[PDB]
Design brief:
Helices cover 15% and strands 12% of the residues. It has one domain. It is of the alpha/beta class. Strands 1-2-3-4-5-6-7-8-9-10 form a ten-stranded parallel beta sheet. This is RING-type E3 ubiquitin transferase. Belongs to the LRR-containing bacterial E3 ligase family. Its main location: host cell.
């Protein structure tokens, strides 16, 4: 096993531009594989490609590189930090994946989301639609894309950020949702379930073209003496 990986890594080490820290990476790969480590940290190495990855890892930390594509993902991966790259797409996501961070890339479409995904951060991509959201999702950050719609939210979603998109309608919001960053979209109305969120929940809808009727309808309720829903920031 070690010889196989070390051969392909040795070859890959020789094939980059001067600024790519391939030798540093090679040495981290070797240590990770030899020590049977759960995490591989190649962040901030200015890497333009990756070779085949150590098979045992559950955390892949590769943020702040120059990557355009990823090699096949280790089969039991749980966590990926791939934000600040130049990725045009993602590979198939392992069933074990819980946390996917790939903000600030060039991704046009996402793969299917695995069933146990809890955290998805893909802000500042090129997405015009999202996959369906899996049942245990807790965090969705998709600000700064080109979305014109969003799929239904799952029942224990904790945080939502979708600012700076083209979204025309929002689905109903679960009571678990404590933070909803909704600014700068094309919403004319809000779901009535906004009013039933926790009293101390954070809701920001600034920069949306909310109708007069929607403003009046929301304001009647938020300004009442018995109102127990969240402050809504306009």
């Amino acid at each position: 096993c070690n010889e196989f990986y070390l051969k392909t890594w040795s070859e890959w080490e020789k094939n980059g531009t001067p600024g790519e820290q391939r030798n540093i990476a090679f040495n981290r790969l070797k240590i990770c594989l030899q020590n049977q480590e759960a995490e591989l940290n190649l962040s901030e190495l200015d890497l333009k490609t990756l070779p085949d990855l150590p098979p045992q890892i559950t955390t892949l930390e590769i943020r702040k590189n120059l990557l355009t594509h990823l090699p096949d993902l280790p089969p039991m991966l749980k966590v990926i930090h791939a934000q600040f790259n130049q990725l045009e797409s993602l590979p198939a996501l392992p069933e074990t994946l819980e946390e996917l961070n790939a903000g600030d890339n060039k991704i046009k479409e996402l793969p299917f989301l695995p069933e146990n995904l809890t955290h998805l951060r893909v802000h500042n991509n090129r997405l015009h639609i999202l996959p369906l959201l899996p049942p245990e999702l807790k965090l969705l950050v998709v600000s700064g894309n080109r979305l014109d719609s969003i799929p239904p939210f799952p029942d224990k979603l904790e945080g939502l950020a979708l600012a700076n998109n083209f979204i025309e309608q929002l689905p109903e919001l679960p009571f678990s949702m404590n933070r909803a960053v909704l600014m700068n979209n094309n919403l004319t109305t809000l779901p009535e379930s906004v009013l039933r969120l926790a009293q101390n929940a954070f809701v920001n809808v600034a920069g949306n073209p909310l109708s007069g009727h929607t403003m009046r309808t929301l304001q009647q309720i938020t300004t009442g003496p018995d109102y127990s829903g969240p402050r809504i920031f306009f």
